[PDB]
Every structure is written in structure tokens, then in C-alpha cells.
Amino acid sequence: TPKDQEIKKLVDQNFKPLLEKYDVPGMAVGVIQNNKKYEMYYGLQSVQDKKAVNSSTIFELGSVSKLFTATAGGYAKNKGKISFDDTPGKYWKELKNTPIDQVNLLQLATYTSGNLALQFPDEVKTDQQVLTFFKDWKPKNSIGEYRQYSNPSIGLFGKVVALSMNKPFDQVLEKTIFPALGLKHSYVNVPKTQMQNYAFGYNQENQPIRVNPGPLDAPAYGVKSTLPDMLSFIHANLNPQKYPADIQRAINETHQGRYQVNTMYQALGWEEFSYPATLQTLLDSNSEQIVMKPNKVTAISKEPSVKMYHKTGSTTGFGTYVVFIPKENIGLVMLTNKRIPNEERIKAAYAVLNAIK
Numbered sequence: 001t002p003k004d005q006e007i008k009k010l011v012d013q014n015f016k017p018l019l020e021k022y023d024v025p026g027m028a029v030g031v032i033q034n035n036k037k038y039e040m041y042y043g044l045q046s047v048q049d050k051k052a053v054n055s056s057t058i059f060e061l062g063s064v065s066k067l068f069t070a071t072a073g074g075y076a077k078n079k080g081k082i083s084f085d086d087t088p089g090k091y092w093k094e095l096k097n098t099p100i101d102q103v104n105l106l107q108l109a110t111y112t113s114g115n116l117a118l119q120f121p122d123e124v125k126t127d128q129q130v131l132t133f134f135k136d137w138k139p140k141n142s143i144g145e146y147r148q149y150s151n152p153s154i155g156l157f158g159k160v161v162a163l164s165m166n167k168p169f170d171q172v173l174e175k176t177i178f179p180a181l182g183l184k185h186s187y188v189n190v191p192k193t194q195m196q197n198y199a200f201g202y203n204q205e206n207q208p209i210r211v212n213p214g215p216l217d218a219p220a221y222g223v224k225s226t227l228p229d230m231l232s233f234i235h236a237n238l239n240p241q242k243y244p245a246d247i248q249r250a251i252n253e254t255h256q257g258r259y260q261v262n263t264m265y266q267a268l269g270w271e272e273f274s275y276p277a278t279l280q281t282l283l284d285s286n287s288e289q290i291v292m293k294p295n296k297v298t299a300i301s302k303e304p305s306v307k308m309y310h311k312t313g314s315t316t317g318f319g320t321y322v323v324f325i326p327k328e329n330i331g332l333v334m335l336t337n338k339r340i341p342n343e344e345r346i347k348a349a350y351a352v353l354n355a356i357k
């Protein structure tokens, strides 16, 4: 049984049943092993257009967007445009001498401001409203001591990174970061020439929907990409040594764990784990306790040299999961145009990666 058919069988056994189980219109699953890429597509990118999912289909990445924000920040840091010790008022000068200016950029990137929730209010619709939000912001818990997974936290980080590069955030990714990685089908704003490839997302009633991020939400969940581009992104994370110094060091920054919460190490964007890791280890990182509630951070006790990394992402209409293991030179990408439980994504991926070869 050739490897391409072996991987297809495994994906059929573990991911394909999720389609019928959760009435998922379309799915893309990619495996990359030893620099060989395997692409498997299922169902429809648009139900009403009867357009099949293929290698050109653009999906909403949801929170996997934060991996690109982290990479952009690592890039800016290694170019000397920011220091992770800086505070936002250095770059968004209107925030100087406000309480949020006691939080440093690393703490924003890793969700430890001590008073930032998961979501940004939908009532904050303009960029001025965003600035006013952070001028009025007041602390709650000791800065840097509690992880509270937060869109506005990394959103502000993204805004600061862009300012340090004197470019809007969308241009940081589309003109600098995406080209640096050869990602030709990845977008913050999908151009008109690409909309024909942009999947409809489907909500829990299977009604079509696409994301409309707010003024602060692009760095938190505004990126769209295809399966080949995400496999290329995985490939870059598997072999950062290939790239010019600033991008190479940028990727390495996103791999450096900054603190631990139980078995999860919070890196920049990426969630990091000791490898081998149990299934429940990976599932715990997406538990209600870790995702929705504050958790005191602790110093990293076991600092693994053999690691794996992953990140789930969702929008109302899409689900994403990416995971890679450098020592095994393997990674996997799952994209769906319907949100399915994070646990099912992680379990199916775990089953495939541990049975490969």
C-alpha cells in the first residue's frame, strides 16, 4: 500500500466520518511528512454553487490567524523595530501614561494583561473607539500573572507591530510576511479575483456565512488561506533554518515557550507541548478551563527539547486545526467550512499522525 493511499485511508478512517456526523459541507486535510505533501479534499466549498473543495479553496482560519500575528511580531522584534519589553504607548503614542501602558508587548501577545476577555465588544466599531477602549482600560489582576485567552490582547499586539513597521497590519502580512513564506493564496482581505475560490462558511444551522472582523480583530482571526499555503506554513515551521535571518528567527520566536499552564507551554501564538504528548494533553489545551477562564501561569519546569505545537481556530462558519512535530518532520492541517468540536479535530489529527508510517 503506497504511502499516499496509506495516508488517505487513515484520513478516511478518522476525518471523513466527521462530515456526516456534523453535516460538514466541505473539508480539506493535508499531511506533510519528510517534505512530501499529501492533500485530501472532501465535499463542497459552496453548497448553493455546487463548487467542490479543491486546492484553490480559501478558508477562514479563525484563531489560527494569531500564528501569523505572532510571526509578524517575531519578525519586527528581530529587525529591531520592537522589543517585547516595550509597552504599547511607545508606538501608539496616544496610550502613553495610561494603565495599559504598564503591560508589555510579550504580555499582550501571551494573554497576561490581567484584564482582557476573549472577545472585543461588537459595539467598538471604529478605530477611534478602539483607541478609547485602551485609554479607559484599567487593570484587574497582577499584570503578567494570569493567562486569559484574549482577542483584544493579541489584537493590540498586532496593531503595535504594524505601527513599528509603519504599515497597516494587513500590509504587514500581505506585503511582508506572506511573501517571505511564498504564501500566494493567503489573505487578510480576499481580492475580487479570488472571491470565486472563497468558501462559504456554514453556521450550526448550515446557513452560509462569512466573517466580518471588527477594527481590532484581523490579527486575532482575520486571515484566510488554502490547504497548500497552510502546508507551506507548516513546512516553514518545520524547517525555519532555510529562511533569511529575520524570518528564521521570527519563526523560532513563535516556538519559544514563555510559561506553562499545566502541560501546555504558551509560546508566541503557538501552543507548545512535550513530545510525545497524550491525546488528553492536547485536548486539555482546548478545555473550558484553559480557553474561557483565567489561569495562573507558572515557570516552565520541564523544558522539552523534543516538542510539538498546535493551534485550533474557529469562526462562526469555519473550523481549523494545525499541528506539527519537528523531530518527526511531520505536520497536519485540517480546514472545514463548518465549525466542529475542537476535541474532534484534535482526536482525528492525533489518530492520523500516530498511525502514519
Ligand SMILES: *[B]([O])([O])[C]([C]N1[C]=C(C([O])=O)N=N1)[N]C(=O)[C]SC1=NN=C([N])S1
Pocket: 062, 063, 064, 118, 151, 210, 211, 212, 213, 221, 312, 313, 314, 315, 316, 317, 339, 342
Ligand atoms: B479563536 O478561534 O480561538 C477565537 C476564539 N474562539 C474559539 C472558538 C471555539 O472554541 O469554537 N470560537 N471562537 N475565534 C474567534 O474569536 C472568532 S468567532 C467569529 N466569527 N465571526 C465573527 N464576526 S466573530
